[PDB]
């Protein structure tokens, strides 16, 4: 009844939190990479420049923050 | 009534799950591509810090 759908809600809500956690983990790795890159934009290495290209690439439903 | 509006919340949550997986895949993909560049240029303190970044582990995560 209610108890069955609420079971689904309960389970889904925790999935949402596991996914947020997982997304925050990956997104933080990129923010750290982007700090290391900004922090060596004086060295002019194209290898770090290859990495900045990747960082800033968009896809469907993803925009540059403004 | 209540079963109508819980089905509604279940549906909403299914979309949130999909959106988060989409968001997560996007970010994991960037990290693999970056890992890819790194595992071509083994042999410099910077790219090894980037690899140190990628490989850092937290509770709930295992290096595969």
């Amino acid at each position: 009844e209610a108890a069955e759908l609420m079971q689904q809600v309960n389970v889904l809500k925790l999935t949402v939190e596991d996914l947020e956690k997982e997304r925050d983990f990956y997104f933080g790795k990129l923010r750290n990479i982007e700090l290391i890159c900004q922090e060596n934009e004086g060295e002019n290495d194209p290898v770090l420049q290859r990495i900045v290209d990747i960082l800033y690439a968009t896809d469907e439903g993803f925009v540059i923050p403004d | 009534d209540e079963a109508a509006e819980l089905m509604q919340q279940v549906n909403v949550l299914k979309l949130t799950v999909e959106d988060l997986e989409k968001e997560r895949d996007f970010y994991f993909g960037k990290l693999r591509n970056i890992e890819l560049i790194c595992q071509e240029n083994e042999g410099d303190p910077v790219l090894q810090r980037i690899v140190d970044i990628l490989y850092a582990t937290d509770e709930g995560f295992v290096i595969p």
Binding site: - | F28, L54, Y55, G60, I63
Partner: peptide, 9 residues
């Protein structure tokens, strides 16, 4: 060769 980026579970 493979990936070594930490992943859940």
């Amino acid at each position: 060769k493979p990936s070594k980026i930490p992943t859940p579970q």
